Design a protein around this ligand. Structure first.
Ligand SMILES: COc1cccc(C(=O)N[C@@H]2[C@@H](O)[C@H](O[C@@H]3O[C@H](CO)[C@H](O)[C@H](O)[C@H]3O)[C@@H](CO)O[C@H]2NC(C)=O)c1
Length: 138
């Protein structure tokens, strides 16, 4: 068990073929989960499942530059469930982050922050018990 919020260093930033894997369990009365890939204070890629946004479940993705959020990208496919174990895998490709949950492809997020080598930490937060967070090169 890792304490949330958890910061996972990404030494030398991200690069294509890097695979980040997060294993956890959603708390039974969850409101949100967030993964934040950071370039100093900027958030290159925010991945944010919301369990009760006006009584709908939605995943919101965005980028924060100079303390300002950008244009949201929303996905209504929602593979998380309160109480239940999950696996999130984020594969860095040359033009996007590719996200799979529980082994099924979920979404892609085009790189808006293009200095991939400067995206040097991942913060993991929200209503989860965190079991493991790791990376490897495929
Ligand atoms: C496209 O259809 C819909 C449906 C329901 C809500 C929204 C929406 O745009 N919500 C964002 C919210 O998603 C946004 O919340 C922020 O959204 C960020 C990601 O964009 C991040 O998760 C922040 O932590 C969170 O506070 C707040 C504050 O920036 O602004 C809100 N926007 C407005 C206009 O109030 C859109």
């Amino acid at each position: 068990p890792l304490i949330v919020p958890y910061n996972l260093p990404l030494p030398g930033g991200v690069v294509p073929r890097m695979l980040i894997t997060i294993l956890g369990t959603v708390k039974p009365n969850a409101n949100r989960i967030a993964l934040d890939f950071q370039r100093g204070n900027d958030v290159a890629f925010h991945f944010n499942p919301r369990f009760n946004e006006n009584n709908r479940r939605v995943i919101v993705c965005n980028t924060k530059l100079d303390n300002n959020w950008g244009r949201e990208e929303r996905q209504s496919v929602f593979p998380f469930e309160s109480g239940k174990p999950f696996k999130i895998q984020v594969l860095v490709e040359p033009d996007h982050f590719k996200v799979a949950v529980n082994d099924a492809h979920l979404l892609q997020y085009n790189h808006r922050v293009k200095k991939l080598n400067e995206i040097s930490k991942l913060g993991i937060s929200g209503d989860i018990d965190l079991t493991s967070a790791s990376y490897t090169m495929i």
